[PDB]
Design a protein around this ligand. Structure first.
Ligand code: HEM
Length: 154
């Protein structure tokens, strides 16, 4: 799938709102992810002890993870699909070091969409939601192919 310039503009318009508070969005996205998929929480050794939302919001380590993830994702989105340079190191942190299935990236994308709608409904209507889902689908498609290229089926 291919995004138009106008679609990329909707994605990056929304992403500008994330960049106004990267750490807080990162917290809310990981918390939503861990609440929907506690089996994913178990894969973070430094976070899997966190048993409540209040604990997760207090965790400096969780906040650091959120910033790391959104910083990398933001760099990827700003490439508007021309992101092969960014996907290679990311696949390796994910496809050799650990084994992060594509389905987990799908769950992560669902949490992003949820948090964007929860924090910015007035700037995140149907067109913007579709465009963000399209950009995240392209991310997942291309990281899946990068996985395979490195010898991991995802
Ligand atoms: C449910 C989805 C995901 C899971 C379960 C997951 C899990 C992990 C794990 C276990 C590590 C290495 C553990 C560590 O050394 O701390 C890691 C590294 C990393 N992940 Fe993810 N990840 C997910 C989604 C994402 C997404 C969507 C992005 C960015 C678009 C991302 C960006 C990174 C980066 C940049 C690193 C390297 C961090 C570093 O070098 O310290 N992750 N991920």
């Amino acid at each position: 799938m291919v995004l138009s310039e106008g679609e990329w503009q909707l994605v990056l318009h929304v992403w500008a709102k994330v960049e106004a508070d990267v750490a807080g969005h990162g917290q809310d996205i990981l918390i939503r992810l861990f609440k929907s998929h506690p089996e994913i929480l178990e894969k973070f050794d430094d976070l899997k002890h966190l048993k409540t939302e209040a604990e997760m919001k207090a965790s400096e380590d969780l906040k650091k993870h959120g910033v790391t993830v959104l910083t990398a994702l933001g760099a990827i989105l700003k490439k508007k699909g021309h992101h092969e340079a960014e996907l290679k190191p990311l696949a390796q942190s994910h496809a050799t070091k650990h084994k992060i299935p594509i389905k987990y990236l799908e769950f992560f994308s669902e949490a992003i969409i949820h948090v964007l709608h929860s924090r910015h409904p007035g700037d995140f209507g149907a067109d913007a939601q579709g465009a963000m889902n399209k950009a995240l689908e392209l991310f997942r498609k291309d990281i899946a192919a990068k996985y395979k290229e490195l010898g991991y089926q995802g």
